[PDB]
C-alpha cells in the first residue's frame, strides 16, 4: 500500500507515529502503575500490610 | 505525488515499513506472552 | 455505493475517521476501566 | 435635531400619550386588584 | 449592523466545516458551523444550569439567588462513571456542554481568522484558557480518579471549592507553581497598566501638544527603568505573561493532589535538606 | 403641560426612547415580581392560599 | 459613624453599590470611546430608511476628538465621517447577514482578506521628520546584526515552493530598528516589489525566504510604490493586504471547508 | 423619502393585520391555558 | 397603532419578541417547578 | 403566514428552529429524568 | 422582501413547512397521549 | 436669577434630559431600597395590614 | 452656539422644563405628604 | 425532496453524522448513569 | 439534483431505522423501561 | 472673581461641581445614618 | 478657555446668584436640622 | 480525482473495513466469553 | 511674592490647591470623627 | 503668564486666600469655644 | 533500511536520541530510588 | 533531500547499527546482572 506514502510525508508520518507509539507506551505503563495489582514497582515479593485490632488505613468518610 | 515520492520511492519505504512493523509487532507479542505468564489479566 | 470518494477527499476522510475510531476506542476502554465490574486491571 | 417634522412630533406624541394612558389604565386596575387581594400599607 | 468599514471584509469562505450552509452573520456576530454548534451547546448548558438551580441541592435549599445557585459535581464514590442527574449527573452534562461551547467558540475564531487573513494568535491564546478549564474539570479529576474533584458551577460555591482545595494542602501559597503563576499574573497586570498608560499618554498628550512618536515611547521607559522593550514586543510580552500565568496555574492545580499530597510548605524540604546547610 | 410638550420628540429620538422604555418597563416589571416572590408576605405561589 | 447604616444596610454594602454606579458609568465612558471608529454603523436598517435612522446602539457617539499629527501633517478627528465606499463583490445570497463573493480575480479584487482602507498618502515620519520605513540603501548607518543572516541575496519562494525572486534590499524602521519589508526582485519581469516581514518565513540554513501567503506567480501583481526609496501609509496597507488575500485566495483548498 | 423603517402605510397596515391576528390567537391559547391552570390549581 | 411598524423593523421586532416570549415562557415554567406547591412533576 | 418567509429567511430560520426544538426536547427529557416520579429509567 | 424570496416561492416553502410541522405535531400529540396513559401528570 | 434659561446654551438639553431621567430613576431606586433595608419603613415585611 | 441652541429655543425649553420639573416636584410633595401621614420619620 | 436546494447534501451528511453520534453517546451515558439500565455491572 | 440524492438519503435512513428498531426490540426484551 | 471663568471652563466646572456636591451629599447623609444618634430611619 | 471678560461676567452673575440660592436653602435645611437634633 | 483513483480507494477502504470489523467481532466474542455483559 | 506666578501656572496651582485642601479637610474631619473626644455625631 | 498678569492673579489669590483664612480662623475660634484641644 | 538517514538529519537525530536516553536513564533511576522496593541506597 | 548520499547513508547506518548494538549489549548485561542481584518480577 504505497499510496499512503504518496499522500503522507514519510518524515512527518514517522515522527507522528513514533511520538504516538511512545506516548501510548507511556500511558499504558502508567495505567498499570495506577492499579496496585499490576504495580511492579512495589516489588516482586510485595505483601500488603496486615491490619489487626480494628485498624483502618483510611479515616471514615462519605 | 503530494509529497514528491514516485511509485518506486513509496514502494521502497513501504517495503521496510512493514519489516520494521513486523519486527516491532513480534517483540510486542513476546512481551505480552511474557506479561501473561508473569501476571494474567483476563 | 462507490462514487462517494469524488466529493469527500479520501485523505482527509481517512484522517478524520481514524481520529474518530481512536478517540472512540479510548472512550470505551476508559468506560470499562471506570466500571469496577469490567476493570480487568483489578481482582 | 432628530429628523422628525413638526407633524410627526405631534402625531407620535398623540399615539404615545394614548398608549401610555392605556398602559397606565391597566396598571391602575392591576394595582386596585392587587390592593383588594392583599393590601401592603 | 456592521462597522462603517466592515462591509468590504464580509467574504464567503474560510470555514473549517460546513461550507456555505452556515457561512453568514447574525447581527454583528459571525456564526458559521461552530457558531451554531456553540450556541446550542451554550443554550443547553445554560438551560440545565437553570434547571439545576430549579431543583437545587434539595427542595428546602433551592434558591434562585444568583450568588447561591450551585450545580455540584458527583460524590467521589461515583468515581469516573456517570452519576444520576440530581446527584452530580447534571454537572457532568453541563461540563460536556461547556467544553463543546468553548471549543466551538475557539474554532469559530479560527474561521474568523481565516476570513480576515490574520494570524491565529487569538484562538491559540484562548486555547490556554480552555486548557486551564480542561485541567480543572477533566485532567485533574481523571488523575484523581473521580469526577467529583471538579469545581461546582456556582458563582460563590466554586469559591468554596477553591478555598477547601487550597487548604487540603494546609498552606497553598507555598505551591511553587502557584507562586510562579501569581508572579506572571501580577507582572501581567503591571505590564498592562504600563502599556495602556504609555499608549494613552502618547496619543493624548499634554494640552496644546501634538501626538508623540515611537521615539517618545522608547525614550519614556528608558528614562524610567533604562530599557524599552519596543512597540511590537510589549504585545509579545503581554501575551507571554498572560499565557504563562495560565499555564503555570494549570500546572499548580494539576500537581496539587495528583502529583503532591502533603502540605505545600513541606515540598520545600528538598531545599532545606540540602547538605550545604 | 403646555401645548408644546410634543417638542420633546424633536429633542429625543422616539424610536430609541420607545426601545428604552419598553426594555426598562420589562426589567422593572420582572424586578418587582421577583422582589415580591422573595418576600414571604407577597409570594403568591408559596403562601398556601388557597 | 458606625459600620451599620440601617438594620440591614452597612458600609461595605454601600461601598460595593457605590462601585457599581461608578463601574456602570465607566463602561458607558469606555463604550463611548470604542465608538469613535466605524460609527455610525452600516445596516439595512439605515439603507431601507434612506439614512433617516443612524445605528449607533447605546451609548450614542461622543463629540469628536482631535489628534494633532506631528510635523503639521494635519488634524484627524476620531469620530469622523467617511465617504461611502463600494465593495468589489456581490452577495452569495440576498438574505441579511449573507457573505459576498469577490468579483473577478479574488487576489486583485481588493475585497475580503485583500480589502484595505485608503490611508493617508504620506510616509510615516520619524521624530526628526525623516521617512521612517526606508530601505537599507538609504539607512546607511543601519546594518544587519552580526549573528543574524543577511536577508539580501536570499531566494524568495511562494506557497508552492516555486522561486519568486531574490531579496534585493531590506526595508527597516528608523524609529525602532527592526525589519519591516523585504524588497524582492521578481524573476519574471525584473520589477522590485515589497514583501512584509510578517509574511516571510526565513530559512537560514538554505538562505531562503518562504512565503506561504501567495504563489510565486502572484508576486508580479503586488502593489508598487510611487517612490522607490520611501513608502506611504497608503501603500503599506495595499502591499500587506495583497499578501493577506493570498491566505484565502491563493489556492482553491484555502477557501475550505476541511470536511 | 421614506419612513424610519422603509415601510409605507399599506406595508405597515398589512404587517399589523397579521401581527394582531397572530397575537390574538396566541393570547387566545394563553387565556385558555390559564383557565385550565386555574381549574387545575388556583394560585390566588 | 399600525404605524408602530414605521418606527420598528418588523423583522427585528419579531426576533426580539419571540426570543423574549420563549425566555419568559421558560422562566415561568421554571419558577413553578421550583415551588413544590405548583411542581406538576412531583407525583 | 407565507409572508413570514419574506421576513425570516428559510436558511437561518430552518436550522435555528431545529436546534431550538432539539435543545427543548433534551431539556424536557432531562427535566423528567431529574424528577423521581417521572424517571422512566429508575427501574 | 428583506429576505430575497418572492411571494410565490415563500408560499411554496410555507406549504412544505406547514405539512412537515403538522406531521411533527401529530407524532407529538400521539406521544403525549401515550405518556398520559403511561403516567398522568395532572 | 433674572436669566436662568441661559444654562441651555452650554449644556445640550437632550443629553441633560437623558441624564436627569436616568439619575432620578437610580436615586428613586436607591431610596426605595434603603427604606426596604429598614425594619421600620419596609412596607412589604412589616405585617401591616 | 455651544449646544446648537439659539436664545429663543433655550427660552422655549426652559419654560416647559420648569413646568415639567414643577409638576414632578408637585407629585413628589404629595407622595411625601402621604408618606408622612402613613409613617412619619421625624 | 426539496430540502436539498437549501441544504448542501455533502455538508449535511457531516453535520448529520456528527449529530447522530453525539446523540447516541448521550443516550448511552444516560443509561450508564441509571443503575437499573447500567449494563456494566 | 434534489430528487436523485433524496432517493438514496431516504434509502439509507430505512436501513438505519430498521437496525434501530431491532436494537430497541432486543433492548426491550433485555429490560423493559415502561 | 468673575475672571475665574477665564481659566475654568464653565461647562466642565459646572458638571464636576454638581457631581462633587452630590457625592458629598450622599456621604454626609450616609455618615448621619451610620450614627445611631442621628439615624432618622430607625424607629 | 477662550472665554473673554464679556461672557465671564454674566455667567459669574448667575453662578453667584445660583450659589446664593443653593446656600440659602442649605442654611434653612441646617436650621431645621439643628432644631430637630442639635449636634453641638 | 477520477473513477480510476476512486474505485481503487473503495476497494482498499472496504477491504480494510471488513478486516477491521472481522477482528472486532472476534474481540467481542472473546470479551463475551471472558465476562458477558447481558 | 507676586513673582511666584511667573513660574507656577495659576490654572494648575488652583486645581491642585483645591484638591489638596479638600483632601486635607476631609482627612481632618475623619480623624476627629474617629477620636471619641471630638466625635460630634455620637450624641454626647 | 506675562509679568503684568502675575500681580493681577496675585492680588485676587491673596484676597481669596485671606478670606479663606479668615473663615478658617473663625471656625477654629468656634471649635475652641465648643471643645478646646489643648 | 540505511535510507532512513536520507530522511532524518543524522546530527539532530543523535543529539535528540542521546538527550532522550539520558533523560530516560535519569527518570528510571529516580523512579527506582523513589520506590522502597528498589531503592539501593537504603542499606 | 537532506543531503546525505545513499552511499554516505550506508556509512552512517553501519556505524549506527554497531553502536546501537554495543549500547544494547551493555544494557542487556546490566539487566541480566540486575536480575541476578534482585529479580523484579
Ligand atoms: C466587574 C467585572 C464583571 C462585571 C459584570 C459583567 C457581566 C457580564 C457582561 C456580559 C456582556 C455581554 C455583551 C454581549 C454583547 C452582544 C452584542 C451586542 O449587541 O453588543 C451591545 C453593546 C454594543 O452595541 P452596538 O454594537 O453599538 O449596537 C449595534 C446595533 O445596536 C445593532 O442593532 P441591533 O438591532 O442588531 O441591536 C440588537 C442588539 C441588542 O443588544 C443588547 O440588548 C445588549 C446586549 C448586552 C447587554 O443585539 C445584537 O446586536 C445582536 C443581534 C441578535 C443576535 C443575538 C444572538 C447571536 C447568535 C450568534 C452567536 C454565535 C456564537 O456591547 C456591549 O454592551 C458590551 C458591554 C461590555 C461589558 C463589559 C463588562 C465586563 C468586563 C469588565 C472588566 C473589563 C475591564 C473594565 C475596565
Ligand atoms: C416607602 C413608602 C411608599 C413609597 C413612598 C414614595 C415617596 C415619598 C416617593 C415615591 C416615589 C415613587 N414611587 Mg413609591 N413608595 C412605595 C412603594 C413603591 C413601589 C413598590 C412596588 O413597593 C414602587 C414600584 C414604587 C414606585 C414609585 C415611583 C412611581 C416613584 C418614583 C419614580 C421615579 O423615580 O421617577 C424618576 C424618573 C423619571 C423619568 C421622572 C420623570 C418626570 C416626568 C418629567 C414627569 C411626568 C412623568 C411621566 C408621565 C412618566 C411617569 C413616571 C413617573 C415618575 C412614575 N413605590 C412605598 C409603599 N414613593 C416618588 C414619586 O412620587 O415620584 C413621582 C416619591 O417622591
Ligand atoms: C475489556 C476487555 C479487553 C479488551 C476488549 C476489547 C474489545 C471488544 C475491542 C478491543 C479493541 C482494542 N483493544 Mg482491547 N481490550 C482490553 C484491553 C486493552 C489494552 C490494555 C493495555 O489493557 C489495550 C492497549 C487494548 C487495545 C485495543 C486495541 C488493539 C483495539 C482498539 C483499536 C482501535 O481503537 O482502533 C482505532 C484506531 C485506529 C484505526 C488508528 C488511529 C490512528 C491515529 C491514532 C489517529 C490519527 C490519524 C492520523 C492523523 C492519520 C492516519 C491515516 C492513516 C495512517 C492512512 N485493549 C481488555 C483486556 N478491546 C477493539 C478492536 O479489536 O479493534 C481492532 C475491540 O473491538
Ligand atoms: C402581587 C403579585 C400579583 C401580580 C400583580 C401585578 C401588578 C400590580 C401589576 C402586574 C403587572 C403584570 N403582571 Mg402580574 N401579578 C402576579 C402574577 C403574575 C405572573 C405569574 C406567573 O404569577 C405573571 C407572568 C405576571 C405578569 C404580569 C404582566 C402581565 C404585567 C407586567 C407587564 C410588564 O412588565 O410590561 C412592561 C412591558 C411593556 C410595557 C412593553 C409593552 C408595550 C405595549 C406595546 C404598550 C401598548 C399600549 C397599547 C395602548 C395597548 C395597551 C395594553 C396594555 C399595555 C397591556 N403577573 C401576582 C398574582 N402584576 C403590571 C401590569 O398590569 O401591566 C400591564 C402591574 O402593574
Ligand atoms: C485558600 C486558597 C489558596 C489558593 C488555592 C487555589 C486553588 C484550588 C486554585 C487556585 C488557582 C489560582 N490561584 Mg490561588 N490560592 C490562594 C491564593 C491566591 C492569591 C492571593 C493574593 O493570595 C492569588 C493572586 C492566587 C492566584 C491564583 C492563580 C494563579 C490561579 C487562578 C487563575 C487561573 O487559574 O486561570 C485559569 C482561568 C480559567 C480556568 C478560566 C477559564 C475560562 C473559560 C475557558 C471560559 C469561560 C467562558 C464563560 C462561561 C463566558 C460566560 C459568558 C458571559 C456572558 C461573558 N491565589 C490561596 C492561598 N488557587 C486556580 C488554578 O491555578 O487553576 C488552573 C485553582 O484551581
Ligand atoms: C401550571 C403548569 C402547567 C402548564 C401551564 C401553562 C400556562 C398557563 C401556559 C402554558 C403555556 C405553555 N406551555 Mg405549559 N404548562 C405545564 C407544563 C408544560 C410542559 C411540560 C413538559 O411539563 C411543556 C413543554 C409546556 C409548554 C408550554 C408551551 C406550549 C406554552 C409556552 C410556549 C411559549 O412560551 O411561547 C413563546 C415562544 C414563542 C412565541 C416562540 C415562537 C417561535 C416561532 C418561530 C413563532 C411562531 C409564532 C406562531 C405563528 C404563532 C404563535 C401562536 C399560535 C397561535 C400557536 N408546558 C404545566 C402542566 N403552560 C403558555 C401558552 O399556552 O402559550 C401558548 C401559557 O400561557
Ligand atoms: C439628617 C436630617 C434630615 C436631612 C438633613 C439635611 C441637611 C442639613 C441638608 C440636607 C440636604 C438634602 N437632603 Mg436631606 N435630610 C434627611 C434625609 C433625606 C432623604 C431621605 C431618603 O431620608 C433624602 C432623599 C434627602 C435629600 C436631600 C436633598 C434634597 C438635599 C441634598 C442636595 C444635594 O445633595 O445637592 C447636590 C447636587 C447638586 C448640587 C446638583 C445641582 C442641581 C440643583 C438643582 C442645584 C440648584 C441650584 C439652585 C438652588 C437653583 C435655584 C435657583 C433659582 C431657581 C433661581 N434628605 C434627614 C431626614 N438634608 C442639603 C440641602 O438642603 O441642599 C439643598 C442639606 O444641607
Ligand atoms: C537500580 C539497580 C542498579 C542500577 C541498574 C541499572 C540498569 C538495568 C541499567 C543501568 C544503567 C546505568 N546506570 Mg545504573 N543502576 C544503579 C545505580 C546507578 C548509579 C548510582 C549512583 O547509584 C549510577 C550513577 C548509575 C549509572 C548508570 C549509567 C552508567 C547507566 C545509564 C546509561 C544512560 O543513561 O545512557 C545515556 C547515555 C548515552 C545515551 C550516551 C550514548 C553513548 C553511545 C552508546 C556511544 C558512546 C559509547 C562510549 C560511551 C563512548 C565511545 C564513543 C564516543 C562517541 C567517543 N546507576 C543501581 C545500583 N543501571 C543502564 C545502562 O547500563 O546503560 C549503558 C541500564 O540499562
Ligand atoms: C489564557 C489567558 C487568559 C484568557 C484569554 C482569553 N480568553 C478568551 C479569549 C482569550 C484569548 C478569547 O478570544 C475569548 C473571547 O471571546 O474573549 C472575548 C475568551 C473568553 N474568555 C472568557 C471568560 C473568561 N476568561 C478567563 C481567563 C482567561 N482568558 C485567562 C486569564 C476567565 C476567568 C479567569 O475566570 C473567564 C471567566 C469569555 C468572555 C470568552 C469565551 C466565551 C465563550 O467561550 O463563549 C461560549 C460560552 C458561552 C457563550 C456561555 C457559557 C456556556 C456554558 C455551557 C455555561 C457553563 C459554564 C461553566 C461550566 C459554569 C459556570 C461557571 C462558574 C464558575 C460560575
Ligand atoms: Ca397562593
Ligand atoms: Ca405593609
Short mmCIF file of N, CA and C in Angstrom, two decimals, chain N residues 1-2 4-5 9 13 20 35-39, chain O residues 1-3 5-6 9 16 27 30-33:
data_model
loop_
_atom_site.label_atom_id
_atom_site.label_comp_id
_atom_site.label_asym_id
_atom_site.label_seq_id
_atom_site.Cartn_x
_atom_site.Cartn_y
_atom_site.Cartn_z
N UNK N 1 -38.40 16.40 -0.76
CA UNK N 1 -37.16 16.19 -1.50
C UNK N 1 -36.54 17.52 -1.92
N UNK N 2 -37.27 18.61 -1.67
CA UNK N 2 -36.79 19.95 -1.99
C UNK N 2 -35.87 20.52 -0.92
N UNK N 4 -32.92 19.75 -0.33
CA UNK N 4 -31.54 19.78 -0.78
C UNK N 4 -31.19 21.02 -1.59
N UNK N 5 -32.18 21.83 -1.97
CA UNK N 5 -31.89 23.08 -2.64
C UNK N 5 -31.60 24.21 -1.66
N UNK N 9 -26.19 18.77 0.17
CA UNK N 9 -26.22 17.37 0.63
C UNK N 9 -24.88 16.84 1.12
N UNK N 13 -24.39 15.74 5.43
CA UNK N 13 -24.06 14.40 5.90
C UNK N 13 -23.05 14.45 7.04
N UNK N 20 -25.88 12.55 15.03
CA UNK N 20 -26.36 11.24 15.47
C UNK N 20 -25.38 10.57 16.41
N UNK N 35 -28.74 3.18 37.41
CA UNK N 35 -28.37 1.85 37.91
C UNK N 35 -29.23 0.73 37.37
N UNK N 36 -30.51 1.00 37.09
CA UNK N 36 -31.39 -0.04 36.57
C UNK N 36 -30.98 -0.48 35.17
N UNK N 37 -30.40 0.42 34.38
CA UNK N 37 -30.04 0.13 33.00
C UNK N 37 -28.54 0.21 32.74
N UNK N 38 -27.72 0.24 33.78
CA UNK N 38 -26.27 0.18 33.62
C UNK N 38 -25.88 -1.26 33.37
N UNK N 39 -25.49 -1.57 32.13
CA UNK N 39 -25.13 -2.93 31.78
C UNK N 39 -23.71 -3.30 32.20
N UNK O 1 -29.11 17.83 -8.36
CA UNK O 1 -30.47 17.29 -8.38
C UNK O 1 -30.94 16.92 -6.98
N UNK O 2 -32.04 17.53 -6.55
CA UNK O 2 -32.58 17.30 -5.22
C UNK O 2 -33.45 16.05 -5.14
N UNK O 3 -33.70 15.38 -6.26
CA UNK O 3 -34.51 14.16 -6.27
C UNK O 3 -33.67 12.89 -6.29
N UNK O 5 -30.57 12.49 -5.06
CA UNK O 5 -29.98 12.33 -3.74
C UNK O 5 -31.02 11.88 -2.72
N UNK O 6 -32.23 12.43 -2.80
CA UNK O 6 -33.30 12.04 -1.90
C UNK O 6 -33.65 10.56 -2.03
N UNK O 9 -30.60 9.11 0.16
CA UNK O 9 -30.64 9.58 1.53
C UNK O 9 -31.77 8.91 2.31
N UNK O 16 -30.98 2.27 8.53
CA UNK O 16 -30.58 2.68 9.87
C UNK O 16 -31.72 2.51 10.87
N UNK O 27 -33.46 -4.55 23.20
CA UNK O 27 -33.30 -3.86 24.48
C UNK O 27 -34.54 -4.02 25.34
N UNK O 30 -34.40 -7.42 26.76
CA UNK O 30 -33.42 -7.43 27.84
C UNK O 30 -33.97 -6.75 29.09
N UNK O 31 -34.51 -5.54 28.93
CA UNK O 31 -35.03 -4.83 30.09
C UNK O 31 -36.09 -3.81 29.69
N UNK O 32 -37.37 -4.10 29.92
CA UNK O 32 -38.41 -3.11 29.62
C UNK O 32 -38.28 -1.88 30.50
N UNK O 33 -38.59 -0.72 29.93
CA UNK O 33 -38.49 0.54 30.64
C UNK O 33 -39.83 1.22 30.86
#
